[model samples]
Target: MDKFRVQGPTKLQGEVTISGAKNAALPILFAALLAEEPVEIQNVPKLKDVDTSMKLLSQLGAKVERXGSVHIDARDVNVFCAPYDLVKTMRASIWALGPLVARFGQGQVSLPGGCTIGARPVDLHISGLEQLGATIKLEEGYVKASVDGRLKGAHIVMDKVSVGATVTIMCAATLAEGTTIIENAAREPEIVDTANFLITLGAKISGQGTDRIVIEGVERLGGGVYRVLPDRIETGTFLVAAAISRGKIICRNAQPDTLDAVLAKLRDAGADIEVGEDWISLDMHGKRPKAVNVRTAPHPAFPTDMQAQFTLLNLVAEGTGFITETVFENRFMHVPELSRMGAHAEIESNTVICHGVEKLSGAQVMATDLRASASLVLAGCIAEGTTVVDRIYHIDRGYERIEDKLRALGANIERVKGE
Candidate 1:
């Protein structure tokens, strides 16, 4: 496996451009399974999970052409089985279940077990599809879903605000007989991005970016082209990167209004923030930042995906701060790895209390998950001496050319290929 060797305690200066939103691109790619003609998706990031999505599409017999953008011709898709090997790597691979059963009337996908973060069950997805007239059976470890002639839409009230269930059921309902209403839907920007892309493909959808979403079933969907939205999580990561390293950097092609919560918190950390139409720049060089408390919630709040990285910022601050993680139960796995890097922190159930330290001494660390890997890299940037981050495959699943991007930003980081 490859690892990152980072020489830190250096301030970064320059610019980094955000990539396509991974969460949005994944479902939009799966939604292409419902298209009658070929669809071209632009600005698709070159990441491991995106490659996993394209491989899943090809395994199901969709002709996927990779050029400047992704061209997926799903009209000829014949297979409906998504194997365990592919689905096991990415939980988003479960997205194929909805599109496959909706278009071909049947699909078999292996159960995506618990990930490193926490228990992310597919029961919401299964129950929502059942409400949309899909007869689903779980035999062994695979989910076998089938519909009769066509799906008949019904009202679906999600037990919780789940992004996966909202997108999954919405994709299945597009081909159903009647109108489908999804209550308590996930209101993330990525969810809105997918809804907009589906609307371009002739899927009648309303109430996106809100708690209640409505989708009117259509007989068939036509081919369309869409450019994926810029990644908000990646943009937030770079914002924290600037603050943690006490550097001045500009992020281009980033949407500022979408990052209201992150921008507010960075301001609380004493980082000078400037925003324009499509860019955000940060500068933190005056003094040690003052710590601020944060709680992770759904959209319009501090994101759970950014909790780990923000914890690193709190560690180097002038005061103590508390981070309450309400999304994933085990998301603070990076705390233990950060502890190895001379961090003073204590975890109390779902909250972490971070104490500021004079300096952090670098140490070799293991990355636990996708967001956790990015946090470790940021910790390395501010720590003394060299820090080696192992299990970078987790990083590759999200960020696009992260080391190269950091190198261009004047960080001493290198990818150590496996022998």
Candidate 2:
């Protein structure tokens, strides 16, 4: 385990480049299993989940080489199972299930278990794959799937809009016998990036940014090179960090178009924001942020991943605001930890009524999840005294060198190794 020691009442100002999206990189890494040649991906963020995905690829017998760029050669992949130990730490491991069965005709991956957010069932994945002509059976704890020959595509109308199911089924459908239509698919930019990655590897996919996606099956996909998209969630985090700390920051390598909803909210909270084609600069100028009501939803809406950080922003804002979590049931795990830091908040079912205070007094806090860890860190940046955040492994699972990034912006934060 590791902890973060942060000295607060600091103002962050500088340029920080956004890294590749974990959500997009995970599925794109697994989609490499469908290729017969070597695949190279650039701008892959160095994070725990990515390391896990690369290790899983190697366990399946792909010769993977990672430098500034990641090179994976899966032509010699001999194994077809995603082990329990690996998949248990990363729910994105389910991505391996689809590509394995698509290219190898069989795959047995463990049931996903990671980040106790809520009931993120793989039922949609199993049901959608079943509709694609794959015989699926949940034996023991693994999803055992195999196809007769090539999967025959059919219309898949998801009961719910899921980014996981959309990417999984879309990858599986790329090798099917015919065209596959996915209705009510997730319209997140990550899904679009994954579709484009597959297209670079020669998969016919259309309508990625819309609710409907259509993938035309091909006989086989060849090797190609692609770069992952800049992480939109990270961009949002930095933008929120500026408002919470009353600092100024310019996020480079950021896609402003992908963050329209988040930028709008920051503007409503009294932050001056300017966005170019590839960058967004925020200047709060020592003024306390104003509380703004927000609710989480799917793409083109306020993201649930940013709810925790925004909650902290409201804690130090000029007025009270409501933060609603509609994507996950148990995302309010950070509220208790935030309350530990001299903040006032009341949780009401799926919403939190956050009351602003003049200043937050620092305290030791435990990070509950990935996004919660970020909230605690941001709180540390603005609190009166010292704030230490424990269990930073959750943060490592997604963020790449977060402490270093914050340090570059003049934040007094350091990582403390713990036994």
Query: Which candidate number has the best TM-score?
Result: 2
Worst 10 residues of 2 by lDDT: 112-121
Q: Residue 221 of model 2: what lDDT?
A: 93
Could you estimate the TM-score for every candidate? 0.98, 0.98
Q: What lDDT would candidate 2 get against the real structure? A: 0.91
Candidate 1: regions farther than 4 A off: 113-115
lDDT of 2 by residue, 279-370 (tens): 99999887889999999999989998889989998998999999999999989888988899899999999999999997888889999889
Steric clash pairs (candidate 1):
none
What do the candidate models score in CA lDDT, each in turn?
0.88, 0.91
* Residue range with the least summed lDDT across 10 consecutive positions in model 1: 112-121
The per-residue C-alpha lDDT of model 2 at residue 117 equals: 81
